[PDB]
Design an enzyme around this catalytic site. Structure first.
Site, mmCIF file in Angstrom:
data_model
loop_
_atom_site.group_PDB
_atom_site.id
_atom_site.type_symbol
_atom_site.label_atom_id
_atom_site.label_comp_id
_atom_site.label_asym_id
_atom_site.label_seq_id
_atom_site.Cartn_x
_atom_site.Cartn_y
_atom_site.Cartn_z
ATOM 1 N N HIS A 1 -0.991 -3.866 5.614
ATOM 2 C CA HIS A 1 -1.994 -4.394 3.836
ATOM 3 C C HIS A 1 -1.123 -5.385 2.585
ATOM 4 O O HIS A 1 -1.267 -4.583 1.569
ATOM 5 C CB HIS A 1 -2.713 -3.278 2.783
ATOM 6 C CG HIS A 1 -3.390 -2.688 3.500
ATOM 7 N ND1 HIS A 1 -4.794 -1.721 3.307
ATOM 8 C CD2 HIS A 1 -3.537 -2.068 5.149
ATOM 9 C CE1 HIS A 1 -4.933 -0.624 3.782
ATOM 10 N NE2 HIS A 1 -4.693 -1.271 5.619
ATOM 11 N N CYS A 2 -0.048 -6.245 3.176
ATOM 12 C CA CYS A 2 0.404 -7.350 2.345
ATOM 13 C C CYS A 2 -0.416 -7.664 1.724
ATOM 14 O O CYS A 2 -1.389 -8.664 3.009
ATOM 15 C CB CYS A 2 1.988 -7.952 3.639
ATOM 16 S SG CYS A 2 1.984 -9.277 2.353
ATOM 17 N N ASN B 1 0.755 -1.250 0.148
ATOM 18 C CA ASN B 1 -0.023 -0.307 0.286
ATOM 19 C C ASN B 1 1.009 1.527 -0.132
ATOM 20 O O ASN B 1 1.577 1.554 0.781
ATOM 21 C CB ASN B 1 -0.873 -0.246 1.416
ATOM 22 C CG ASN B 1 -1.929 1.320 1.237
ATOM 23 O OD1 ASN B 1 -1.231 2.855 1.519
ATOM 24 N ND2 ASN B 1 -3.081 1.089 0.585
ATOM 25 N N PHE C 1 -12.742 -7.192 3.219
ATOM 26 C CA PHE C 1 -13.067 -5.706 2.977
ATOM 27 C C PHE C 1 -13.896 -5.641 3.895
ATOM 28 O O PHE C 1 -14.742 -5.551 3.064
ATOM 29 C CB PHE C 1 -12.990 -5.944 1.028
ATOM 30 C CG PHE C 1 -12.728 -6.323 0.214
ATOM 31 C CD1 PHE C 1 -11.671 -5.816 -0.249
ATOM 32 C CD2 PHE C 1 -13.094 -7.159 -0.635
ATOM 33 C CE1 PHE C 1 -10.632 -6.600 -0.588
ATOM 34 C CE2 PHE C 1 -12.092 -7.952 -1.868
ATOM 35 C CZ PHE C 1 -11.237 -7.496 -2.191
ATOM 36 N N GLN D 1 -15.020 -2.647 5.338
ATOM 37 C CA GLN D 1 -16.148 -1.450 5.221
ATOM 38 C C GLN D 1 -17.242 -2.326 3.649
ATOM 39 O O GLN D 1 -18.317 -1.382 3.896
ATOM 40 C CB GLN D 1 -15.122 -0.501 4.350
ATOM 41 C CG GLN D 1 -15.477 -0.396 3.264
ATOM 42 C CD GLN D 1 -13.700 -1.658 3.211
ATOM 43 O OE1 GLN D 1 -13.356 -1.712 3.721
ATOM 44 N NE2 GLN D 1 -13.392 -1.328 0.755
ATOM 45 N N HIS E 1 -4.433 -2.678 9.753
ATOM 46 C CA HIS E 1 -5.959 -3.681 10.250
ATOM 47 C C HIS E 1 -6.763 -3.080 9.406
ATOM 48 O O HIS E 1 -7.041 -2.128 10.549
ATOM 49 C CB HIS E 1 -5.927 -4.963 10.882
ATOM 50 C CG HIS E 1 -7.152 -5.174 9.729
ATOM 51 N ND1 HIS E 1 -7.227 -6.770 8.628
ATOM 52 C CD2 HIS E 1 -8.444 -5.134 10.523
ATOM 53 C CE1 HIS E 1 -8.566 -6.426 9.116
ATOM 54 N NE2 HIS E 1 -9.382 -6.070 9.915
#
Ligand SMILES: [Cl-]
Lengths: 238, 244
Positions: free
Chosen positions: A75-76, A10, A105, A107, A94
């Site tokens: 965010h690996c 990221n 995901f 959200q 996270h």
């Protein structure tokens, strides 16, 4: 002095850590930080630009990891093997509020199920939470909007907590949940035009599945043509 | 030769008619054409640029219109009074397939109720979008299309109808036919009811998508709901045959 590894795919979170190191003497005096992106990243060019080497965490030998005080996952894209997390202190940044909508995901799922959403820094295990905080979902917001608040919050969490976590000055605590699979995600994408529900349910589904220019939600029409769908919501008309 | 009045608030149609006149000797040899926009038009600037004067057809006196062989209405925002249509030959270029979804925004209503959509050139009588039809043609609504997509296809078809028929109409070479039925008219109030979404409405996802795509027409959003805190949230949808 400690040597640290950050494994991230990221751009934003890696840039942010790098900018904290550069602007905070407390980081620069205490730490050597290596940064790597995942060997599975299909598009690492901007991480290369940013200053990062490729790592394959699934096949990396523990023997080559002995210098690291700890490893940070931000965010690996690859899952760390059990043997890495059991033999090295591994911390995850996270984009969800553990223990709600763990998995894929967060959200997207919170938009649909109304469970809390947020960000969490926690220890990896086959984990204990150092810090987390909730963000709100507002009525006009899509998955990308909530994810963007989440990234914002991650940066805040990093900025206020990460050095302390690295220096052992903040002790974690076991979560007081639920998990969502990629297949759950994919089931949501395949719209059923015959689904009976409230307009509210159906708008929420479209908003959960709207994330930038890449469309996810699709139906097949009368002629078996694939049609992707997204929604736009706004507090302005124009 | 004949003198013609075009009243229109649509740039694309007026510019089209101007361009046919400029490009077809048959037009320029037979016709003097005056072009006017509606006094009610809040933003006539592009029309002014185009070469057009303001007209108020609602208060225009009949005696000022004696020179005109006929008057053409092309998406005139003002409704022609009965006395004008009953005493002057008036021809309407309508972006609907009459008699289906007569009145406002035919393609919106057709996406919702599945009645035919298209374009019609018809004589104006004292009822809205109701007189004898010179020519008309259907267009299709495909699964990925919004109000603006169908509107653009309708405009394209109006151009083709004018191009193929309008001189003949002016020259009394094409006789019109009664509409097949009384049909159905939609008002502006009908459209504004649609815009006010009911979040508790119970329906198929198809119905909901159709409602959102009927209400999606460019960057100006029509559909809205009010949320928990009474904030107004506008809604549009995007449908596409490609992912990105
Ligand atoms: Cl009838």
């Amino acid at each position: 002095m400690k040597k640290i590894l950050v494994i991230s795919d990221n751009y934003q979170l890696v840039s942010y850590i790098k900018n904290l190191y550069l602007s905070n003497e407390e980081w620069s005096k205490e730490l050597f930080i290596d940064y790597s992106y995942s060997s599975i990243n299909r598009n690492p060019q901007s991480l290369i630009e940013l200053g990062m080497t490729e790592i394959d965490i699934k096949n990396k030998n523990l023997n080559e990891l002995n210098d690291y005080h700890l490893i940070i996952s931000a965010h690996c894209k690859q899952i760390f093997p059990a043997h890495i997390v059991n033999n090295k202190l591994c911390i995850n940044i996270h984009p969800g509020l553990n223990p709600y909508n763990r998995g894929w995901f967060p959200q997207v799922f919170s938009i649909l199920n109304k469970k809390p959403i947020g960000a969490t820094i926690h220890k990896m295990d086959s984990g204990e939470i150092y810090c987390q905080e909730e963000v709100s979902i507002l009525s006009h917001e899509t998955s990308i909007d909530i994810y963007n608040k989440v990234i914002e919050l991650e940066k805040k969490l990093i900025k206020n907590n990460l050095l302390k976590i690295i220096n052992n000055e903040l002790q974690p605590k076991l979560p007081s949940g639920n998990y969502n699979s990629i297949q759950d995600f994919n089931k949501l994408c395949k719209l059923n035009l015959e689904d009976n529900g409230s307009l509210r349910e159906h708008i929420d589904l479209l908003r959960a599945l709207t994330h930038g220019d890449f469309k996810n939600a699709y139906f097949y029409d009368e002629n078996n043509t694939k049609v992707f769908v997204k929604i736009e919501l706004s507090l302005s008309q124009e």
